[PDB]
Each structure stands twice: as structure tokens, then as C-alpha cells.
């Protein structure tokens, strides 16, 4: 029992070990200009990513008719009032739902990171082999010659969820030999989804092979960051203002960190210091909260302090942070908070009731954020927020999965609240 030593210098570590619903507002959070140099990336890197996906748009158009891999944004005012009732706290401003749960390919946030990793790797090779240029129409990549080119290479991932689902599906559509290693206890539908695209799912109980790696890959991060500029266009189309007078609070589910980090960077680049991002994690897997708060990042894990890392949020069940995401983005995060499985399960049902939207438990992490921001007068005083500014604010909950989850599984999720 050497975890008691850390609990001395870091008071909040007591609540995390006790599985207490914690809400930590970052005192060392700052403007874009001051946060930027730590990120390791720049706007141009995102501009490249935007124009990468612009080049693959003709390819993806034909490949998956369901397609730009982008989700709608919708106001969820009935859900707002329901949260106000159940938990008490008033929610000032409009609440919006980002439905990355309904993205093409993998019905999840990974559709941004996963696909982009695959496409960028596939592009790189094609350019290096002298079979393609950046001025070519990327529909060429569907040809039998290019399928044969890609079959020469291979991709591999260890994931029982949306990472292996996204990489798996996209890698196969390109032409790669794809292999997703998985536990046999994983749900059969995901194995079936993968194998219908020609993926080799290996079940348990090399210079040619590219491994994904969510802990370090900047490519994934930059792929997520493409969401920022797209959201700005949606907001412009809907006559929605993001300003000092109209602040934008964003609530992002967090697993290892890549997803919400990349999105938060891209949003920061898009909307400046009037965007205010937050990470949401399960009480049983608070790795990014634990890593940022202590400053130990990837050095410390949730298992070390005695937390089991077991939770209904399968996508968020990550015991150790990415590390670089913590050091890179911490300054651009206004706060981090936890919520227990029952809170996710209950909100998941109320969202279905009030809005007719069905998500997986992990997606409901951001939903708790709004009332926790509105409750804290410490946070509002710390960031110089007036009461009128709060009233004209936009609270954007970021849903990260649900669209492809079959009925049987969704019926399982709904029977808990
Ligand atoms: Na986590």
C-alpha cells in the first residue's frame, strides 16, 4: 500500500481511488498562443490533414456511398431540461450534440483518427512508389493494379473496439492485408463486421507490417483535429456565434486521449480562446485526469493507485494515458472530470427519451459536463465569465459512438436506468 504517499501531496487522488465523481478545473490553463508550442503540431499540419481528406474525397465517395467523414450537429433542448430536472443544476445557454456516433465507416470518433491513419499510410506508399501524385484523382486507388499494390503491404492492430473496427474496415477497402487481434470474449457482431470486409480477426483467450498505436501516433491526433474547422462551417451555416459574449464549452469523452485531444486542438485553432474544452472519463478509468492532475502523465496508471479499470464505457476503459497528449494539450484544457457508470447509463436512456438518439455508454461522458461547468463559481470566476455570457453560451456535448451498435446490444444498454 504505497499509494497513500501520492494521496498526501495530491488531495484529489483520494477521491479518484474512492471512485468519487470528481470535477477538476485546470488552474494552469491558458490561451491558444501560450498552449500552442507544447502541442508538437501546428495549424499547417492540420491544413495538410484537411487537404489530405479533400484528396481522398473522390475515393471515399465511391467506396462507401454513405459518405467527407463528418457528422451533423443538432440542438438537444429537451435533453437540456431533462438534465436540469434529474440533477437539479440549471444549464445556461443552448446545448448541442455532436453526433460523431453516426459517422460513416465505423459509427464512431475513430472514423476520424482511424481512417486518416490508414489513408495517410496508403497515400505515402503510393507516392513513394511513383504510382500517384497529389494532383491525381484519388479514385485511381480503387483499380485492380492499386489493390494489388496494397496487397503487397499489410496493417495490424490490437483492438476489440472502434479503433480496430475503423482501421480494419478502411485498411481492407484500400487493399492491405489486415489483421485485427482480439479476445474471444468480444462481441460476435464486431468480428462479423470486420470479416465481411475481408479482415482477418485472430482470436485469443516485420518490415512490411504497419502497427497503429493509439498511445503515440500524431497522425491519429491530427486526423481528429480536422473536426475543428468543419464544426466552424456548420456553426456558420446555422447562424451560431462563438465569441466572448457567446462562449463555446465543449465536453469530450476520453480513453487514451488522442480523440478528445486532437478534436480540442482543432477547435482551439478554429475558435481561439472562446472555445473551452473539457475531458470526460469513467471513475474506474481516470487516466488522463490522474495523469494531468499529478503531472506524472504516462508514468502513473489507474491500476497503481488501486482502480480496477473495469467499466461500461468499453471505449474509455484505458488505464494509462498517452503521455504526449497530456503534456501537449493540458494548457488548452479548461478542466477534466469523472462520472460513474450509472450516470452514463441513466443519461443514455434520457437522451433516447427526450431526443430519440441512441448512443453507447462511452458517448454519454460529455453529457455530464455542462451542469458541472455551470455549478462551479470557482471556474466561472477563474475565467472571468459573467452571468450574461454564460446565458449566451453554447454547451457542445461530443457523442463518440452508437450509430453502428446493433439492436440487441442497444437493448442491453437501455435496460440499466
Ligand atoms: Na480513460
mmCIF file of N, CA, C and O and ligand atoms in Angstrom, residues 254-255 281-282 285 287 316 318, ligand 1:
data_model
loop_
_atom_site.group_PDB
_atom_site.id
_atom_site.type_symbol
_atom_site.label_atom_id
_atom_site.label_comp_id
_atom_site.label_asym_id
_atom_site.label_seq_id
_atom_site.Cartn_x
_atom_site.Cartn_y
_atom_site.Cartn_z
ATOM 1 N N UNK A 254 -12.951 10.675 -23.098
ATOM 2 C CA UNK A 254 -11.513 10.400 -23.148
ATOM 3 C C UNK A 254 -11.145 8.959 -22.771
ATOM 4 O O UNK A 254 -11.446 8.493 -21.670
ATOM 5 N N UNK A 255 -10.472 8.278 -23.698
ATOM 6 C CA UNK A 255 -9.941 6.930 -23.483
ATOM 7 C C UNK A 255 -8.460 7.031 -23.171
ATOM 8 O O UNK A 255 -8.082 7.284 -22.027
ATOM 9 N N UNK A 281 -14.085 11.219 -18.353
ATOM 10 C CA UNK A 281 -13.627 9.837 -18.185
ATOM 11 C C UNK A 281 -14.496 9.092 -17.171
ATOM 12 O O UNK A 281 -15.183 9.724 -16.373
ATOM 13 N N UNK A 282 -14.477 7.746 -17.201
ATOM 14 C CA UNK A 282 -15.159 6.994 -16.146
ATOM 15 C C UNK A 282 -14.401 7.070 -14.823
ATOM 16 O O UNK A 282 -13.173 7.229 -14.829
ATOM 17 N N UNK A 285 -11.737 4.507 -14.742
ATOM 18 C CA UNK A 285 -10.585 4.701 -15.639
ATOM 19 C C UNK A 285 -10.251 6.185 -15.849
ATOM 20 O O UNK A 285 -10.403 6.701 -16.957
ATOM 21 N N UNK A 287 -7.451 7.935 -16.208
ATOM 22 C CA UNK A 287 -6.022 8.006 -16.513
ATOM 23 C C UNK A 287 -5.548 9.407 -16.898
ATOM 24 O O UNK A 287 -4.520 9.874 -16.407
ATOM 25 N N UNK A 316 -13.723 3.907 -23.315
ATOM 26 C CA UNK A 316 -12.975 4.737 -22.367
ATOM 27 C C UNK A 316 -12.152 3.923 -21.357
ATOM 28 O O UNK A 316 -11.413 4.500 -20.557
ATOM 29 N N UNK A 318 -9.385 2.724 -20.392
ATOM 30 C CA UNK A 318 -7.955 2.828 -20.639
ATOM 31 C C UNK A 318 -7.267 3.213 -19.333
ATOM 32 O O UNK A 318 -7.590 4.243 -18.739
HETATM 33 NA NA1 LIG B 1 -9.631 6.899 -19.639
#
